[PDB]
């Protein structure tokens, strides 16, 4: 199912949805995969998250050009870390409109990230204010509350079985929540569960650092987080 294109991998998850994967070789630690989404919505493409770098993100745009050959209307990035926002200059250079959580844009400079052009805001229930996310088509953006970071956001694809937890969700076989450095350990469990409740029909859970999984990834992540609080 995987298609390789330079140093990147693309996996088709639905007729109009692909997972993009980029790698960062870290000496000793080895290659670290980060996943995002590419969505074909009629006559345009929507991207969720950049690659680790500008160069890798340019290759995502080249692949879309080659395999889909539609313009990229917009990209949404799911928090102010390198794996999700490392490639913002490459999207900008391409004249792609970028959206992030207002708080992601606010944290970006301290994190060494370039801010998105536009800020998303959320209701108290976690759902994006539609006026901040115009023409998002099937992208349903949900802020589940603090977990991996204070700014972490999530994306469901309307009319598919796919919801994207980004770095908030770990796979159902994960031994731990990984590094708990920039994390809200108190609210993590509830944030995991809010993601679950926001996209109840999603049977395929896509995440940053594991292969697509079942809803068991949400319940496992929440149950690991329970043992922190």
């Amino acid at each position: 199912g995987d298609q390789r294109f330079g140093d990147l991998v693309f996996r088709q998850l639905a007729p109009n949805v692909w997972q993009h994967t980029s790698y960062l070789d870290m000496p000793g630690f080895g290659a670290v995969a980060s996943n995002g989404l590419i969505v074909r919505d009629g006559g345009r493409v929507l991207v969720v998250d950049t690659a680790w770098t500008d160069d890798q993100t340019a290759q995502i745009l080249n692949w879309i050009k080659q395999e889909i050959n539609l313009p990229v209307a917009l990209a949404v990035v799911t928090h102010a870390h390198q794996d999700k926002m490392g490639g913002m200059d490459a999207l900008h250079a391409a004249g792609i409109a970028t959206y992030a959580n207002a708080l992601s844009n606010q944290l970006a400079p301290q994190e060494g990230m370039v801010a998105a052009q536009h800020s998303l805001t959320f209701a108290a229930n976690g759902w994006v204010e539609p006026a901040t996310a115009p023409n998002f088509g099937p992208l349903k953006v949900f802020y589940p509350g603090p977990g991996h970071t204070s700014d972490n956001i999530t994306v469901g694809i309307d009319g598919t079985d796919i919801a994207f937890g980004g770095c908030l969700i770990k796979d159902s076989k994960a031994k731990s929540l990984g590094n708990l450095g920039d994390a809200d350990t108190e609210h993590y469990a509830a944030s995991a569960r809010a993601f679950g409740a926001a996209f109840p029909k999603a049977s395929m859970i896509v995440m940053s650092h594991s292969a697509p999984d079942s809803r068991a990834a949400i319940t496992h992540t929440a149950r690991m987080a329970d043992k922190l609080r």
Partner: peptide
């Protein structure tokens, strides 16, 4: 370095 899961 803030390389996602890798804290350096």
């Amino acid at each position: 370095x803030x390389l996602x899961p890798i804290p350096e």
